[PDB]
Amino acid sequence: TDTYNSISNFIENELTALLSSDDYLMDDLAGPNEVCRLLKAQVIEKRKDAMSRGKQDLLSKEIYDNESELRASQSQQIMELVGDIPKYSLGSELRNRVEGEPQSTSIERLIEDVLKL
Amino acid sequence: SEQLLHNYVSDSLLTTLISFQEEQQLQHWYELLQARDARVTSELEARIKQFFITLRSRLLRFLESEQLSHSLSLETLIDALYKINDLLQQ
Amino acid sequence: VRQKRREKQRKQSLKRVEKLALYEIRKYQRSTDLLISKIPFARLVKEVTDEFTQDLRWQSMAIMALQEASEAYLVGLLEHTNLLALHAKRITIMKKDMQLARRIRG
Amino acid sequence: PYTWKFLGISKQLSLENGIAKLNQLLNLEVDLDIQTIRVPSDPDGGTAADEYIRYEMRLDISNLDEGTYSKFIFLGNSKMEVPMFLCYCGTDNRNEVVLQWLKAEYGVIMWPIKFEQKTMIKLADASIVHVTKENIEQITWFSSKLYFEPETQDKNLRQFSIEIPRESCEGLALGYGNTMHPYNDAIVPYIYNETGMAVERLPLTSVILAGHTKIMRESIVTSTRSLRNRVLAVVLQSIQF
Amino acid sequence: SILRLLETNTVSALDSVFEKYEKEMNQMTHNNEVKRIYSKKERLLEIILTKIKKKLRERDLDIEYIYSKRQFIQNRYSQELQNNERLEAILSREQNLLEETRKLCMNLKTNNKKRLTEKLIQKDLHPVLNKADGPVTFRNDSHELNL
Amino acid sequence: SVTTIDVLSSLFINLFENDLIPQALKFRKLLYKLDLRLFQTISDQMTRDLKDILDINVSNNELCYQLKQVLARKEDLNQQIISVRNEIQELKAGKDWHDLQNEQAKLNDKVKLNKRLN
Amino acid sequence: LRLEDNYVPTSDTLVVFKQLMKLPVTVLYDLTLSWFAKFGGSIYLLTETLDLLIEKGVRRNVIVNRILYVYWGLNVFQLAEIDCHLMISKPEKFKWLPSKALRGDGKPYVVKLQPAKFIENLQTDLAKIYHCHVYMFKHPSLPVLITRIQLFDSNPLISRRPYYVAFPLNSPIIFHSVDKDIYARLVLQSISRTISERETIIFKPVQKIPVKSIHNIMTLLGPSRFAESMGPWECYASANFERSPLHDYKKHQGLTGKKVMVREFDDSFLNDEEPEIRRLRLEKNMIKFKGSASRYSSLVPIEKVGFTLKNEINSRIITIKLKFNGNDIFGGLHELCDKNLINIDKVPGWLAGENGSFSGTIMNGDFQREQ
C-alpha cells in the first residue's frame, strides 16, 4: 500500500539531500578553506544532469517498474498455492456460514449445497 | 532494482570527478578523500539494502493478507460444518 | 449568504459573457447613464462642503442629482466650446477655446 | 434539389410574340421551344383532349450555380376551362421580374396552386411512369415513404408515416394486374384493406419516393431539372373546375 | 517584486538555522550567553545587507507553494498507480476465472461425447433401445393424474 | 532568463561579500570564518533554490503528462474488467451450457438405469 | 472506499437551491427533522423554532435559506433524499426503460429481494471498481422499490449523473433509467451479479424505446392485470362486464340485454344526423380503442411505436413499415377515427392499441415483439 510515495520519499530524503549538502560542504574536516570550497564548487558544477528532479523521478519510475515485475511473479505464485477448497465452488450457505451471522437458516438450501462440496 | 540504485549512488560521487585531475602534500590530501567518500557509501549501502528488505516483506505480508481473505482455511470450514451437523442433528 | 452566491454567479456570468477615434463620438452620444466615478466624486463634494460648513450629512440622491447636474453643465460647456474650436480651424481643442465660452456666458 | 413552385395562369396565350420585350427588359436571350407533346402516346386516347403545347423557357446561362438556374415549364390546352399554367424553380430575382412582365404585358391572373390528396396520389402515380423512345410506357419502382401530419388534442398524434419498400411495391403491382395506375388501384386499396386508414381523407403532407422525387402540398422537389409530361398533365387536369 | 525579498528572508532564516547548527558544534572553545549575543550581532548584520539588497534592487512565484503542488501531484499519482495495481489484480483473477469456466465447459463437452461413445458400445437391448414422445407423455400424464 | 539574471546578481553579491570576508579572514578566528559560512550557505541555498524551482516546474509538467496517461490506462482497464465479467456472466448462464448440463444428467441417469436393469 | 452517509461532496450551492425550491413546506419540515435526528449540526429545542416558523405562514425561500445555511452541499445522503423526493413529486421528468431477468434455460426469475442485505452487497460489489453510494426507498403509492445509484470521479470528487434502477416487488422485469455510457453497463451488470446469490441471472432488455413515467411503466410491464391486455381487451383486465356467481340474476347482461348496432360488411365507407346513432358510433369507437365507456387519452400514453406488416399474397412477401410519433399515439388515433377518417370495421387489433409500447413485426396475423 502506497509504495511509490515511499520510494520517492526514500530517494528524496536519503540520497539527494545526503549527497548535496553533507557530501559537498561538510567535507572540510580534513583542512585550507579555499581549496575545499573550490573542489566542492567543481563537483557541484560538474554534476547537473543526475541530481535533477526529473532524473530521480525517472529512477523512481524504473524502481517501481522493477518492483512491479517482481510483484507479478509473487502474485501469480500466491494465487497458485494449494486451493484449500477455495470459493466459487460451494453454495451460498457454506460461504455464509464461513463469513458468519447468516441471519436466515434454510435446511433445503443446506441440503442442496452440502451435496455440492 | 538494487543494481540501479547502487550504480546511481556510485556514479554521482567525488571519486569520479576529483581524481580525474589528480604536489607532495596535495597527493596525500585527496588520498584521505577517497577513503572518507568510500566510508559514507558503506553506511549508505546498509540502509538501501535494509530498505529493499523492509519493502518486500511489507509487500508480501500485504499480498498474503488480501489472498487469504479470498481463500479458505481448513479450520473455520470444519467449524461451520460442525454447526451444520448440529443443526441437522436437531 | 445567498445574496453573496447570487453576486458571485452574476460576476461569473459577466466574466464569461460580458467580458481612428471616430467610433467613440457616436458611441458615447447615445449613452444615457452617468460617466463620473461615484465615490471619488462623493469624496470631492464632501471636501467642497467642508469649506462652507459642522458634521453636515448627505443624502445619496442629492449627490446623484449633483453628479447629473455637473455632468450636464460640463457637456454643455464642452459642446459649446467645440463650435468655437472648429470655428478657429482647430479640430484639436485648447484652453483658449474654453475661455471665451467661460467669458461670454457668465 | 430543384423545388418546383407552381402558379396558375388565367387566359390562353401564345409565347412566340412579346418575348423580345422580355429580352429588352432583361438584356438576356432565352430559348422557347414549342413541344406539341401528347400524354399516353398509346392509341387508346382518341387523339382528343390528350395533347398539350409545352414551352420550356430555359435560361441558357453559366451553370456554376443551381439555385440561380431557373427553368419555366409551361403547359396549355384549347379545350379546358382553365387553359394554362406554369411552374418555376430557383431563387433568382429573374423569376420576380418575369412574373412582373407576365402580369404586365398580357394582362393575366396569377395565383399559387394548393394540392389536394387525390391530386398527390395521381402525381405519385404519374411521376414513375417512364416514357421510352420505343412508344411504350415502362414503369420503374421506388421505395415510397408516405407521410401524414394531423392535428389532435394536446398534440396526441403528431406525425406518422407509411413506408413501403420497392420489392413489395412491385409485388403489389404484379399481383393487382396489368394497369398504368398502381398507386390508385393497388396500394391505396391494400392500405385500406389491411389498416383501414383511407389515405384520401387523412391529411397528407409529403408523398416522398426513394430519393427520386418529393411531392408536397405546395411544391414538388426533384433530383433532376426536367419534369415529365404526365406529371404536368395531371397537374393541369387537377386545377380544372 | 517583493517575493524576491520574501524568498531571500526565508533563505536567510534557513541559513541562520544551518549556521547555528554548526556554531553549536564549534562552541568547544566558547557559555550560553557568550555565543547568543554574538550570533544576535550578526543577525542584524545579515539583516543589514538584506536591507541593503533592497537598496541594491517579472513574476511572483514562491517555492513552498509549488513544492506543495508537487507533493499533491505525486500523492494523486501514487493513489492512481495503486488503483491501477488493484484493478490489474482484479482483471487477472477474472481472466483466471473465465479460462477456468471455459475449460470446464469444454471438458464437460468432451466428457459428454466420450460418455455417448462408450454408451454406444454398451449393451442396452430390451428396456432402453426402444427410445434411445418419450419424456413428454410422462410429464403430461404426471400433471394430469397428479402423480 | 530572468531567474538566471537574478541568480547571477545574487551570486555576484555573494561572491563580493565572500571575497571581502575571506580577505578579512586572514579568539576571533571562529568569528572570522562564521560570516563566510553564512555567505556560503546563502549562495548555495539561493542557487539550489532557483535550479530546484526550474526542475520542480519541468517535473510537474512531466508528471502531469504521465498522470494523464495513467488515467487513460485506468479507463481502459475499467472497460476490460466490464467486458471480461460480462463474458463470464454470458458464458455461465448460456443456453448451450444448460443444454449440455441437461444432456449430461440424462446420460448419467440412463447409464445408472441400464446398469441396474442389467 | 465505499462512501458512507457522513461524507459531503463538493457541488454548487445554487443548483441545490433550485432543486429544493421545487418542494412544498411540509416535506421540507420532514427533511429537516430527519436530517437533524440523524446528523444534526448548528434536540427538541431547535424543533420548536421551525414549528413556530411554519405556523406563521412563511415562504419557502426563508426556510430553504434556513436548511442551506444551518448545514453549510449537505452530504451525499441528503442529496439522495432530495432527488428521490423530487422523483416522487414530479414523475413526468424521468424516462424509464424495461429489461427482463432470465436465468438457466430461459425461464423468468422473480427477484423477491429484501432491502436490507441487498444494499451492502451491491455497495461492496461496486466499491471494488469506483467510488459509489447507493440509496433505496419504497414508493409510497405504487408497490415498487426505487434505487438511486450515484457514482463519482477524481478530477475533490466530481459527481456523475445519478443512475436509477427501479425494482418492482414480484416481477422479473426490472426498470432502469435510460443511459448507454460505461457506468450504466457497470451498474446494471453489478446488480445482475449481486441479486442472484444462488444461480446466475442475466438481463436481456425487452424494449429499446423509453417510456415516460413510473406509473405508466408499472401499468404496462409490472405486476398488474393490465400487463398484457392493454387494448380492446381492457375489459378483461377490470372485469366490469360480469359479476360473481353469487350475484343476482335479475341484473345480468344475459337477462337485460345490451343495446347494439348492426355492423356493415360491404365496402360502404368510401361513399360519404340521427343523434342516437351518432352516440352509438361514438360508443363503438370507445369500445374498439378502449374498454367499455381528457376523454380521448388512453390509460397509458405511449411515445413512439414502429410496426411492420409482412403479409403474403400469391407467394409474395409484401412488407410495409408503419411508424408513429407524438405524445399519446392511440388516443390521437381514436380521435382521428372519431372524426370518421378511419373505417373502424377494418382496424386490426395491433393498431387498435393492444400490446402497447411494443414495436414489432407481424408474420401471418399474430404479433411478436422485436429484440
Tab-separated table of N, CA, C and O in Angstrom, chain E residues 43-87:
chain	number	residue	atom	x	y	z
E	43	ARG	N	22.897	38.756	13.410
E	43	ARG	CA	21.509	38.606	12.986
E	43	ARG	C	20.995	39.886	12.342
E	43	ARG	O	20.258	39.847	11.353
E	44	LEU	N	21.384	41.037	12.894
E	44	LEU	CA	21.018	42.305	12.276
E	44	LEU	C	21.990	42.667	11.163
E	44	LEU	O	21.648	43.410	10.237
E	45	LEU	N	23.221	42.149	11.242
E	45	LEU	CA	24.214	42.411	10.203
E	45	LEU	C	23.855	41.680	8.914
E	45	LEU	O	24.074	42.194	7.814
E	46	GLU	N	23.305	40.471	9.040
E	46	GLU	CA	22.735	39.800	7.878
E	46	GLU	C	21.448	40.487	7.442
E	46	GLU	O	21.080	40.457	6.263
E	47	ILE	N	20.751	41.118	8.389
E	47	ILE	CA	19.569	41.898	8.040
E	47	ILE	C	19.962	43.248	7.458
E	47	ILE	O	19.168	43.894	6.764
E	48	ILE	N	21.189	43.695	7.734
E	48	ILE	CA	21.657	44.958	7.178
E	48	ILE	C	21.934	44.831	5.689
E	48	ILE	O	21.543	45.694	4.895
E	49	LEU	N	22.607	43.749	5.288
E	49	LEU	CA	22.861	43.516	3.871
E	49	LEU	C	21.587	43.096	3.151
E	49	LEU	O	21.452	43.288	1.937
E	50	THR	N	20.641	42.507	3.888
E	50	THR	CA	19.331	42.208	3.316
E	50	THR	C	18.553	43.487	3.050
E	50	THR	O	17.859	43.608	2.033
E	51	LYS	N	18.660	44.461	3.957
E	51	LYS	CA	18.068	45.769	3.709
E	51	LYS	C	18.851	46.522	2.642
E	51	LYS	O	18.283	47.313	1.880
E	52	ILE	N	20.159	46.275	2.568
E	52	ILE	CA	20.971	46.892	1.524
E	52	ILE	C	20.703	46.248	0.171
E	52	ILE	O	20.946	46.852	-0.878
E	53	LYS	N	20.205	45.008	0.179
E	53	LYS	CA	19.817	44.358	-1.067
E	53	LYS	C	18.568	45.004	-1.649
E	53	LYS	O	18.376	45.028	-2.869
E	54	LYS	N	17.701	45.533	-0.781
E	54	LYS	CA	16.571	46.324	-1.254
E	54	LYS	C	17.048	47.652	-1.828
E	54	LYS	O	16.454	48.185	-2.771
E	55	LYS	N	18.131	48.193	-1.268
E	55	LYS	CA	18.750	49.379	-1.849
E	55	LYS	C	19.526	49.019	-3.110
E	55	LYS	O	19.669	49.842	-4.023
E	56	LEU	N	20.038	47.791	-3.175
E	56	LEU	CA	20.701	47.331	-4.389
E	56	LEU	C	19.689	47.076	-5.498
E	56	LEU	O	19.992	47.235	-6.685
E	57	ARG	N	18.476	46.684	-5.127
E	57	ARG	CA	17.413	46.461	-6.097
E	57	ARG	C	16.568	47.717	-6.257
E	57	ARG	O	16.850	48.747	-5.645
E	58	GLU	N	8.889	40.047	-15.208
E	58	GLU	CA	8.866	39.808	-13.769
E	58	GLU	C	7.669	38.948	-13.370
E	58	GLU	O	6.675	38.880	-14.095
E	59	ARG	N	7.771	38.295	-12.215
E	59	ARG	CA	6.704	37.422	-11.748
E	59	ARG	C	6.708	37.318	-10.227
E	59	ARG	O	7.563	37.888	-9.543
E	60	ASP	N	5.728	36.576	-9.697
E	60	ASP	CA	5.605	36.318	-8.262
E	60	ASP	C	5.373	34.817	-8.064
E	60	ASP	O	4.235	34.348	-8.001
E	61	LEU	N	6.469	34.065	-7.957
E	61	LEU	CA	6.435	32.614	-7.823
E	61	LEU	C	7.240	32.202	-6.603
E	61	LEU	O	8.462	32.381	-6.571
E	62	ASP	N	6.559	31.641	-5.607
E	62	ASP	CA	7.230	31.209	-4.389
E	62	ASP	C	7.778	29.797	-4.553
E	62	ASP	O	7.759	29.227	-5.645
E	63	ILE	N	8.269	29.230	-3.450
E	63	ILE	CA	8.875	27.903	-3.510
E	63	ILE	C	8.002	26.885	-2.785
E	63	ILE	O	7.797	25.764	-3.271
E	64	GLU	N	7.436	27.273	-1.639
E	64	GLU	CA	6.661	26.336	-0.834
E	64	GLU	C	5.327	26.011	-1.490
E	64	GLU	O	4.817	24.893	-1.344
E	65	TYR	N	4.767	26.964	-2.240
E	65	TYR	CA	3.513	26.720	-2.946
E	65	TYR	C	3.700	25.682	-4.045
E	65	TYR	O	2.916	24.731	-4.158
E	66	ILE	N	4.752	25.831	-4.851
E	66	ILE	CA	4.979	24.879	-5.932
E	66	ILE	C	5.495	23.554	-5.372
E	66	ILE	O	5.278	22.490	-5.964
E	67	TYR	N	6.099	23.587	-4.177
E	67	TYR	CA	6.507	22.356	-3.510
E	67	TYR	C	5.298	21.567	-3.030
E	67	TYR	O	5.236	20.342	-3.202
E	68	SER	N	4.318	22.254	-2.439
E	68	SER	CA	3.098	21.582	-2.009
E	68	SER	C	2.268	21.132	-3.202
E	68	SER	O	1.578	20.109	-3.134
E	69	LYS	N	2.338	21.873	-4.314
E	69	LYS	CA	1.655	21.443	-5.530
E	69	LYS	C	2.282	20.172	-6.091
E	69	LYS	O	1.573	19.257	-6.528
E	70	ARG	N	3.618	20.088	-6.061
E	70	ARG	CA	4.296	18.864	-6.482
E	70	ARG	C	3.983	17.702	-5.548
E	70	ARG	O	3.825	16.562	-5.996
E	71	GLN	N	3.877	17.981	-4.245
E	71	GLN	CA	3.535	16.936	-3.282
E	71	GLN	C	2.124	16.409	-3.511
E	71	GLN	O	1.893	15.195	-3.459
E	72	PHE	N	1.178	17.306	-3.800
E	72	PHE	CA	-0.190	16.891	-4.090
E	72	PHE	C	-0.263	16.115	-5.402
E	72	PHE	O	-1.009	15.128	-5.507
E	73	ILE	N	0.530	16.525	-6.398
E	73	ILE	CA	0.565	15.822	-7.677
E	73	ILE	C	1.135	14.419	-7.506
E	73	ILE	O	0.579	13.442	-8.022
E	74	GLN	N	2.216	14.292	-6.733
E	74	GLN	CA	2.831	12.987	-6.517
E	74	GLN	C	1.940	12.082	-5.678
E	74	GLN	O	1.901	10.864	-5.896
E	75	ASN	N	1.187	12.661	-4.740
E	75	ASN	CA	0.274	11.864	-3.928
E	75	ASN	C	-0.893	11.343	-4.757
E	75	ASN	O	-1.274	10.169	-4.636
E	76	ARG	N	-1.461	12.196	-5.619
E	76	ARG	CA	-2.504	11.746	-6.538
E	76	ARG	C	-1.982	10.705	-7.518
E	76	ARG	O	-2.703	9.757	-7.859
E	77	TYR	N	-0.729	10.853	-7.952
E	77	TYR	CA	-0.128	9.889	-8.866
E	77	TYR	C	0.059	8.535	-8.197
E	77	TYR	O	-0.215	7.495	-8.806
E	78	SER	N	0.495	8.531	-6.936
E	78	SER	CA	0.650	7.276	-6.206
E	78	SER	C	-0.699	6.617	-5.946
E	78	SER	O	-0.814	5.384	-6.005
E	79	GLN	N	-1.735	7.425	-5.694
E	79	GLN	CA	-3.077	6.884	-5.493
E	79	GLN	C	-3.608	6.224	-6.759
E	79	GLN	O	-4.132	5.100	-6.712
E	80	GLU	N	-3.465	6.896	-7.905
E	80	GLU	CA	-3.936	6.315	-9.158
E	80	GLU	C	-3.102	5.110	-9.573
E	80	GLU	O	-3.631	4.165	-10.175
E	81	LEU	N	-1.819	5.100	-9.217
E	81	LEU	CA	-0.971	3.956	-9.515
E	81	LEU	C	-1.379	2.735	-8.699
E	81	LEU	O	-1.440	1.618	-9.228
E	82	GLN	N	-1.695	2.936	-7.415
E	82	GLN	CA	-2.157	1.820	-6.594
E	82	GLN	C	-3.538	1.345	-7.032
E	82	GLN	O	-3.843	0.145	-6.950
E	83	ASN	N	-4.380	2.264	-7.518
E	83	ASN	CA	-5.671	1.861	-8.071
E	83	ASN	C	-5.499	1.013	-9.322
E	83	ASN	O	-6.224	0.028	-9.515
E	84	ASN	N	-4.535	1.367	-10.176
E	84	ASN	CA	-4.279	0.544	-11.354
E	84	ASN	C	-3.694	-0.810	-10.977
E	84	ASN	O	-3.971	-1.811	-11.645
E	85	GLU	N	-2.911	-0.865	-9.897
E	85	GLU	CA	-2.411	-2.152	-9.415
E	85	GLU	C	-3.546	-3.047	-8.924
E	85	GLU	O	-3.588	-4.246	-9.244
E	86	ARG	N	-4.484	-2.472	-8.166
E	86	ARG	CA	-5.623	-3.240	-7.670
E	86	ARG	C	-6.526	-3.705	-8.807
E	86	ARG	O	-6.999	-4.852	-8.805
E	87	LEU	N	-6.752	-2.845	-9.801
E	87	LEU	CA	-7.580	-3.251	-10.931
E	87	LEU	C	-6.872	-4.272	-11.811
E	87	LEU	O	-7.536	-5.120	-12.415
